[PDB]
Scaffold this active site. Structure first.
Site, PDB file in Angstrom:
ATOM      1  N   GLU B  16     -23.861 -43.237  66.386  1.00  0.00           N
ATOM      2  CA  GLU B  16     -24.619 -42.042  66.051  1.00  0.00           C
ATOM      3  C   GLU B  16     -23.585 -40.932  65.746  1.00  0.00           C
ATOM      4  O   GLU B  16     -22.730 -40.648  66.561  1.00  0.00           O
ATOM      5  CB  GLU B  16     -25.548 -41.666  67.174  1.00  0.00           C
ATOM      6  N   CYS B  63     -30.511 -35.698  70.057  1.00  0.00           N
ATOM      7  CA  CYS B  63     -30.223 -37.057  69.631  1.00  0.00           C
ATOM      8  C   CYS B  63     -31.491 -37.896  69.635  1.00  0.00           C
ATOM      9  O   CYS B  63     -32.287 -37.880  70.568  1.00  0.00           O
ATOM     10  CB  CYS B  63     -29.199 -37.668  70.540  1.00  0.00           C
ATOM     11  N   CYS B  66     -30.575 -41.920  71.613  1.00  0.00           N
ATOM     12  CA  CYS B  66     -30.982 -41.712  72.989  1.00  0.00           C
ATOM     13  C   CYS B  66     -32.108 -40.672  73.008  1.00  0.00           C
ATOM     14  O   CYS B  66     -32.095 -39.714  73.746  1.00  0.00           O
ATOM     15  CB  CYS B  66     -29.771 -41.374  73.855  1.00  0.00           C
ATOM     16  N   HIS B  70     -32.913 -36.533  76.636  1.00  0.00           N
ATOM     17  CA  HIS B  70     -32.693 -35.106  76.795  1.00  0.00           C
ATOM     18  C   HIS B  70     -33.975 -34.373  77.152  1.00  0.00           C
ATOM     19  O   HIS B  70     -33.902 -33.348  77.839  1.00  0.00           O
ATOM     20  CB  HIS B  70     -32.047 -34.525  75.515  1.00  0.00           C
ATOM     21  N   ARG B 461     -25.716 -44.141  77.768  1.00  0.00           N
ATOM     22  CA  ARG B 461     -24.266 -43.933  77.631  1.00  0.00           C
ATOM     23  C   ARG B 461     -23.648 -43.224  78.830  1.00  0.00           C
ATOM     24  O   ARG B 461     -22.463 -42.988  78.824  1.00  0.00           O
ATOM     25  CB  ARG B 461     -24.002 -43.196  76.320  1.00  0.00           C
ATOM     26  N   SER B 484     -21.394 -38.807  76.050  1.00  0.00           N
ATOM     27  CA  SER B 484     -20.356 -38.954  75.032  1.00  0.00           C
ATOM     28  C   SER B 484     -19.376 -37.787  75.051  1.00  0.00           C
ATOM     29  O   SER B 484     -18.269 -37.924  74.549  1.00  0.00           O
ATOM     30  CB  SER B 484     -20.935 -39.124  73.645  1.00  0.00           C
ATOM     31  N   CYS B 528     -22.024 -41.332  70.684  1.00  0.00           N
ATOM     32  CA  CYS B 528     -23.121 -40.523  70.125  1.00  0.00           C
ATOM     33  C   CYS B 528     -22.625 -39.132  69.940  1.00  0.00           C
ATOM     34  O   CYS B 528     -22.436 -38.390  70.897  1.00  0.00           O
ATOM     35  CB  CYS B 528     -24.316 -40.610  71.090  1.00  0.00           C
ATOM     36  N   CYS B 531     -25.126 -36.182  70.423  1.00  0.00           N
ATOM     37  CA  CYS B 531     -25.084 -35.991  71.860  1.00  0.00           C
ATOM     38  C   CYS B 531     -23.859 -35.265  72.294  1.00  0.00           C
ATOM     39  O   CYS B 531     -23.953 -34.259  73.080  1.00  0.00           O
ATOM     40  CB  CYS B 531     -25.148 -37.379  72.594  1.00  0.00           C
TER      41      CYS B 531
END
Ligand code: SF4
Ligand code: SF4
Ligand code: F3S
Ligand SMILES: [Mg+2]
Lengths: 267, 534
Positions: B16, B63, B66, B70, B461, B484, B528, B531
């Site tokens: 991503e 994102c 994922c 969030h 992640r 990330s 990501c 992210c």
């Protein structure tokens, strides 16, 4: 990469969250394997393509310069502040990339509210000067078909592409450049809770018995009355959509919705 | 053919977001690395002044890979700030949607993001489908026949013969590559399952929509709980359960055996991409206010010292900016965070990324599946230990092999298997709770004028945290510190390499024009960048 026989698609990622790309992977009847093996030739797509780095950029150049033509599908807003430097790929600004590539496309589709209207990074105070594709590139004559939503229904992308391939033209578009075949009705006029709305039967809180019984979510902020999309009809993932999950519409297929539809829990 | 000089990979694809990896190579091995994140959006800036209830809707758009994570972190954060204790069913529903997210995410990562670093799809055309079917049937309880695999081969042959290679255009394996080891039959098996996974992931994502409205970007969470009364119904629960069971079968019968057959072929990859320090936040709570009530528990490990797992102290996080495109050099705890962009171009004033550099007690920390798995193992987690041991035994390697790119890739599989089983346990608990007559899914709450809150999610992640300072009932400060960011952020003001940068030192590169070894390690972290930067 591509030459003859399946139409070439170049898919670009600007200032985006990849949720629009993910939405395309949810394609149903046709599924994404059929789309990329049979329907189309997906000739550049940073999320899933094998090549990286220089090899990836050579794949892009080969696609864009093909005498066979390509369709551009664009995800994300274009950051324009500070001469574009907030977003770069291969050390080129996204503004520069899109300015060079999009005028060469046979057709451009702006996929998702970020590409159509600027989206989340364009919300106030818009530190990166993010713009939708047509806004950013009006001076070059780019007029992308806008498929709005955050993310859109992938039904609406596939349907637009299929239409274009069959008819060699865009379908009828609304004043925001969105296809009327998908964006011609408000969410609200399609909503199963409309009889409660008409009766002034509103949930006063999410914990309430009225919310349990499926009363209208307008008092809790529902933006269905001011939002054009096909959510109640097509649903998402062949199974659900926000209001049927008990949550108000947040207006996600409308321009500037982050600032126009907020606070999300008020009307 | 052993190269000295720079290599740049920009864009890094099959992640991503927008990542530029720069390395210095000496005599065919990487000696230095930079992780450069090349898009900024500024969601923290955008949130200032807004209604705290609106945060999750904005931050979910950090994102879409994922997705949901969030929204969950922001809702946990605001829930915490306002002091609401959500109903048991809201915890169950939120946990079930998160478990489903893990399964979708990791399946797509292995096949659709990682596997083209190890699978030569065009070599599958050369395969004997009858031999391949025998191999496939030997590694899985699922039987595959020659005709099953010939159908894949035929479809691939038609595709390749068109000369329109699409996503395989200029692949590093085209023509052959010395770092690609699989035989044709194993390539065919993996390619068949890549294709199968394109359809299976539709079901895995649909599981999230059953309760969560839609995927991507769910719409069922609120401060105080969830909104989806229909999630209480036997019909929706049955729908979820059927999708989960099919997804779990794919994990157990397709993904894990493929992961092991590829790992066994690339066992040299136990020797590259190790890291020193690990952080994890725990996930799947019984109590939203106690991290130690989570099915996976939080923890911190330094220098691979797993006999001495340290408690996680949330006050020991600071995010550095010295090597980032932000003003100044001062690291900040996220309740005192600052997001003040100042671009200097690549290596201008020794700055090379839009990511901040989070440090824990000053140290760079890997987070994600390898952290979650290794810390849970070392805490005695019985399911994690059973699966991990079985994997190590199957591969014929000892536990030291986990500290590597192969190890990390394996750990992603391990956690997928463990979470796939645990979703069934949560589902049963949820059913049991409904059956006791508990039909409540949201609790009332009140907005304070002044408060601090934090929400913690262990996402696919790793350790995700959202941090709010409420002032006059509005967002005074909102800071995201994302997995990330930990793993792929740049150096800090002590010049310590981040986990991804450090892990790249030692990477062999056979062919500098096609540097698949760099991709293997970078992809093993599952980057990501939307992210990491937000
Ligand atoms: S429109 Fe929404 S889902 Fe699509 S890239 Fe933008 S933020 Fe992500
Ligand atoms: S829930 Fe929203 S879309 Fe449905 S009737 Fe009420 S206001 Fe309209
Ligand atoms: S939030 Fe978006 S997905 Fe549909 S229900 Fe409202 S337009
Ligand atoms: Mg941050």
């Amino acid at each position: 990469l591509m030459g003859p026989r399946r139409p070439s698609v170049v898919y670009l990622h600007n200032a985006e969250c990849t949720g629009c790309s993910e939405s395309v992977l949810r394609a149903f009847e046709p599924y994404i394997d059929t789309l990329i093996l049979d329907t189309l030739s997906l000739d550049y797509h940073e999320t899933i393509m094998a090549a990286a780095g220089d090899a990836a950029e050579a794949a892009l150049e080969q696609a864009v310069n093909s005498p066979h033509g390509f369709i551009a599908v664009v995800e994300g807003g274009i950051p324009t502040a500070a001469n574009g430097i907030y977003g770069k790929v291969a050390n080129h600004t996204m503004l520069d990339i899109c300015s060079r590539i999009l005028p060469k496309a046979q057709a451009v589709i702006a996929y998702g509210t970020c590409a159509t209207f600027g989206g989340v990074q364009a919300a106030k105070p818009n530190p990166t000067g993010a713009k939708g594709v047509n806004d950013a590139l009006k001076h070059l004559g780019v007029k992308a078909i806008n498929i709005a939503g955050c993310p859109p229904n992938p039904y609406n992308l596939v349907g637009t592409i299929v239409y274009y391939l069959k008819n060699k033209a865009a379908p009828e578009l609304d004043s925001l450049n969105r296809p009327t075949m998908f964006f011609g009705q408000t969410v609200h006029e399609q909503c199963p809770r409309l009889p409660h709305f008409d009766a002034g039967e509103f949930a006063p809180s999410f914990e309430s018995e009225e919310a349990r019984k499926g009363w209208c979510l307008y008092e809790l902020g529902c933006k269905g009355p001011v939002t054009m999309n096909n959510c109640p009809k097509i649903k998402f993932n062949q199974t659900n959509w926000p209001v049927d999950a008990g949550h108000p519409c947040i207006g996600c297929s409308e321009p500037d919705f982050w600032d126009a539809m907020t606070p999300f829990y008020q009307n | 053919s052993s190269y000295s000089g720079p290599i740049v990979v920009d864009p890094v694809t099959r992640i991503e977001g927008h990542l530029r990896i720069e390395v210095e190579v000496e005599n065919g091995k990487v000696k230095n690395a930079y992780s450069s994140s090349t898009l900024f959006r500024g969601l923290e800036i955008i949130l200032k002044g807004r209604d705290p209830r609106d945060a999750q809707h904005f931050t979910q758009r950090t994102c879409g890979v994922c997705t949901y994570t969030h929204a969950l972190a922001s809702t946990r954060c605001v829930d915490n700030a306002v002091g609401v204790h959500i109903p048991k069913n809201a915890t169950y529903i939120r946990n079930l949607v998160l478990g489903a997210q893990y399964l979708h995410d990791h399946i797509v990562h292995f096949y659709h993001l990682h596997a083209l670093d190890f699978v030569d799809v065009t070599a599958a055309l050369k395969a004997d489908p009858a031999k391949a079917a025998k191999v496939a049937s030997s590694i899985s309880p699922r039987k595959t026949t020659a005709a099953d695999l010939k159908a894949v081969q035929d479809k691939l042959k038609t595709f390749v013969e068109t000369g329109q290679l699409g996503p395989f255009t200029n692949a590093y394996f085209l023509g052959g590559h010395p770092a690609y080891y699989l035989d044709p039959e194993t390539n065919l098996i993996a390619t068949a399952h890549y294709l199968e996974a394109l359809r299976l992931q539709v079901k895995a994502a649909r599981a999230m929509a059953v309760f969560g409205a839609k995927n991507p970007h769910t719409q069922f969470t609120v401060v105080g709980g969830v909104t989806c009364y229909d999630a209480l119904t036997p019909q929706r629960i049955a729908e979820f359960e059927a999708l989960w069971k099919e997804t779990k079968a794919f994990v157990d019968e397709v993904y894990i055996p493929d992961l092991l057959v590829v790992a066994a072929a690339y066992k040299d990859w136990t020797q590259y991409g190790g890291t020193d320090n690990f952080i994890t936040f725990g996930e799947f709570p019984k109590d939203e206010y106690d991290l130690n009530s989570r099915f996976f528990k939080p923890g911190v490990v330094f220098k691979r010292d797993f006999k001495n797992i340290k408690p996680f102290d949330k006050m020991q996080i600071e995010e550095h900016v010295r090597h980032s495109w932000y003003e100044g050099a001062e690291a900040r705890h996220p309740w005192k965070g600052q997001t003040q962009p100042k671009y200097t171009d690549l290596h201008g004033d020794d700055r090379y990324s839009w990511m901040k550099a989070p440090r824990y007690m000053g140290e760079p920390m890997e987070t994600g599946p390898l952290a979650q798995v290794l810390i849970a193992y070392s805490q005695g987690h019985p399911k994690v230990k059973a699966v991990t041991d079985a994997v190590l035994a199957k591969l014929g390697v000892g536990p030291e092999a986990l500290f590597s790119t192969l190890g990390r890739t394996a750990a992603r599989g391990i956690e997928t298997a463990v979470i796939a089983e645990y979703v069934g346990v949560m589902l049963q608990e949820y059913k049991d709770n409904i059956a006791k007559g508990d039909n409540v899914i949201c609790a009332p709450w009140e907005m304070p004028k002044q408060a601090e809150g934090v929400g913690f999610v262990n996402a696919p992640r790793g350790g995700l945290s959202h941090w709010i300072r409420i002032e006059d009932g509005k967002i005074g400060n909102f800071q995201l510190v994302v997995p990330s960011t930990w793993t792929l952020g740049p150096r800090c003001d002590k010049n310590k390499l981040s986990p991804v940068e450090a892990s790249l030192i030692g990477t062999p590169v056979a062919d500098a024009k096609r540097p698949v070894e760099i991709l293997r390690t970078v992809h093993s972290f599952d980057p990501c960048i939307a992210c990491g930067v937000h």
